[PDB]
Write a protein that binds this ligand. Structure first.
Ligand SMILES: Cc1ncc(COP(=O)(O)O)c(C=O)c1O
Ligand SMILES: Cc1ncc(COP(=O)(O)O)c(C=O)c1O
Lengths: 420, 442
């Protein structure tokens, strides 16, 4: 039970100072308690609390956010459909990516390819593209049109294979799954730049360079899911430019408003923009609260804060290096096999031994603990099975990292004992 | 800046439910402000909105209490998970309140980010309640043609807008659709009651083809908002309750539009003595002040899905929505709307019923529609009636009224706060708008 929260810190009812290294839920990228946000939300609910997002008319809070996103991501992205959540964004992407192919006269290109252990929402669509299997479990989920493939989890799958060749491989597991559905039946492949909720699953640097080749030889679209990775998480404003990707569609959410408002949307490449506006008809997809003005206001201010105050540029050039390098330092711990991270996200692997390397029978019970001990030691840290992870706000300081490591290293040293 | 705002809107901003292209030339209507039942666009024109914007602004605009609680809840923590939370979190209230104003048997509620998201969950858990009752073959949900139940890939499969399916093979497994009770557009002569029984017994018709063992549930909006204001012969709903019993299936009444006073009563279920098993609500749950929706869960299905099956809501939006319901009950907004102004508006809408171009004038509560027709007593429909309403809208907006065209059906759903003097404005504004459209053809 928390009373207050400011910057990167939380305080519970007993005074308990807690460093939220989890940005709450991957989103609070400015940190808690930048009142600049509640003022503009208070003040925009005044003029217009709500008006329709385009059915007849538009409204300014949304046009402004639209420019800003056209601006942090101008490149080939200069258009944004809005929506009420990040899962609701992927529903949009799935339907319009099928509309794109329809208008080019290929209604058979309607299969989108995801990956096992991807997360792409909670809706019926979004849970079907995601490969958690715990959201598929209700019977019929992978709705027709969805196929899934290999995740590039170098550590949990093939800990020995040359990381470079393991990347190159598991990238061709896409070129595999194409010649057996049929290129002409595939509309697109969809990935998170870095799988977040599935573990901080970082591809070998070989993976993405491959997957781009594969969407060239073949006539299919790329859908990079920047919902967690977006707005500084990878040091860069978006993962697509850490991984030199030129997506066709991007769902975004969460850090769009640093979690302070229900809001998401899909950016649209100038490629798939062209086909939808011209040579196109009515787009009967749409959604009340799409560019809801209050959230658009809050989100506009949120991005406005981030570039004006230079929050992400510091995070990526000043602090991301420091965090990643200190994280690897826990790599030399008896309980830690691999230490991963790009930018402002990272993960530790909980393992029984290092030199002969044996998993736990049920690694979840260990990680499920080790987090509950980080909180009890003043640090929030998600557990995915036996993987521990952090996704801090981008306003962390070079001192708040020394805090986070030293608190993590205590939490690890403590976890070892209760087993031994 | 208009000239400039409109530039940017086409330049990058995208635009739910719109050609994208036939409106980048013509420019967008940019609305800056709003208070009461009025909006103001960039040219400062006052517009009377009898559409609650999009059926939601049941409070009427510019209600200060809502921004004050939103400013205040942003001060506490966003999200409310299990390990830590905001003391006295808004989500807890709202479920107590939402339980109080809901046909009794609904005493559990699950929150979600929209009304479409809500209908997905309901699709998920309706099959999940049958699984746990050992009938996993019970998976078919049944909507009606021209119904609207959301815009997620689930919602668009569930809604009988045939314009969203044909673009591909979208209506996903497990979804069938049936006749709508549009007495005017299907059987304008048939006895209004007989059509209701016939379009309702068309449900016992489908199940006799599919197999009772396949249908999981039935779903309708008490009245279909969108597709028109397609109000059922008073015979209809008493049938569907019968058909839904002897057949062992769940009822999903969709109260997103029809919910929170829109039909004079708090909900449509109330007005039609329906006892939904699942209720998606999300338009006027916060009177549009903030994105949020959810599902009510009848005590029946709530015991199977919550209990020995313990598996499977933004806090700031929960607060706003909680206070919106508060205001509406304390200040009797919905009680008056249904007893003072609803009978009143329901009379004078029927007046426009006999302008030279009106065949039917339909209405319940603070919702209602009329039908646009070529000749009245000779009875004729328009060739491409959509082109017609397209005009009557632009003339209603320029005559200062937001009045909505679904094909050839003109609709209004003003805030519940409309005053008896404000209907005269809306009636006269519409009446002028009507004689304006009559000339542009005749
Ligand atoms: C990759 C990805 N896509 C979509 C989502 C949708 O989540 P939500 O519905 O909370 O916006 C998530 C959120 O992290 C995600 O990680
Ligand atoms: C019955 C019903 N469900 C859902 C919706 C809309 O869903 P959402 O609020 O998520 O856009 C509407 C109208 O748009 C509706 O009338």
């Amino acid at each position: 039970i928390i009373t207050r929260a400011e910057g990167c810190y939380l305080w519970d009812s007993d005074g308990n100072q807690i460093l939220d290294g989890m940005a709450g839920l991957w989103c609070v990228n400015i940190g808690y308690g930048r009142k600049e946000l509640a003022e503009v939300a208070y003040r925009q609910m005044q003029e217009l609390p709500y008006y329709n997002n385009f059915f007849q008319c538009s409204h300014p809070p949304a046009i402004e956010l639209s420019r800003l996103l056209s601006e942090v991501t101008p490149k080939h992205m200069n258009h944004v459909f809005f929506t009420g959540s990040g899962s609701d964004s992927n529903d949009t992407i799935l339907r319009m990516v099928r509309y794109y192919w329809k208008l080019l006269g290929k209604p058979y290109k309607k299969v989108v390819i995801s990956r096992e252990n991807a997360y792409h929402g909670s809706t019926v669509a979004g849970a079907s593209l995601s490969g958690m299997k715990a959201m598929h479990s209700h019977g019929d989920l992978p709705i027709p049109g969805i196929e899934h493939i290999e995740q590039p989890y170098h550590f949990g799958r093939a800990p020995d294979m040359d990381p470079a060749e393991f990347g190159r491989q598991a990238a061709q597991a896409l070129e595999r799954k194409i010649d057996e559905i049929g290129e002409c039946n595939v509309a697109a492949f969809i990935a998170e730049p870095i799988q977040g909720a599935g573990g901080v699953i970082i591809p070998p640097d070989s993976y993405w360079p491959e997957i781009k080749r594969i969407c060239a030889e073949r006539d299919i679209l790329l859908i990079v899911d920047e919902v967690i990775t977006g707005f500084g998480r990878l040091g860069t404003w978006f993962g697509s430019q850490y991984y030199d990707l030129q997506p066709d569609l991007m769902p975004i959410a969460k850090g769009l408003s640093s979690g302070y408002m229900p809001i998401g949307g899909v950016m649209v490449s100038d490629r798939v923009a062209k086909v939808v506006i011209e040579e196109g008809g009515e787009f009967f997809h749409g959604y009340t609260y799409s560019g809801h003005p209050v959230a658009a206001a809050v989100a506009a201010e949120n991005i406005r804060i981030m570039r004006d105050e230079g929050i992400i540029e510091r995070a990526g050039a000043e602090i991301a290096p420091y965090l990643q390098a200190r994280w690897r330092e826990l790599g030399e711990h008896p309980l830690v096999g691999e230490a991963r991270g790009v930018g402002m996200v990272a993960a530790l692997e909980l393992v029984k031994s290092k030199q002969p390397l044996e998993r736990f029978e049920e690694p979840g019970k260990v990680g499920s603990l080790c987090r509950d001990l980080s909180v009890k030691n003043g640090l929030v840290m998600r557990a995915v099975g036996g993987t521990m992870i952090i996704s801090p706000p981008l306003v962390l300081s070079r001192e708040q990292v020394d805090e986070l490591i030293d608190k993590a290293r205590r939490t690890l040293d403590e976890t070892h004992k209760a087993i031994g």
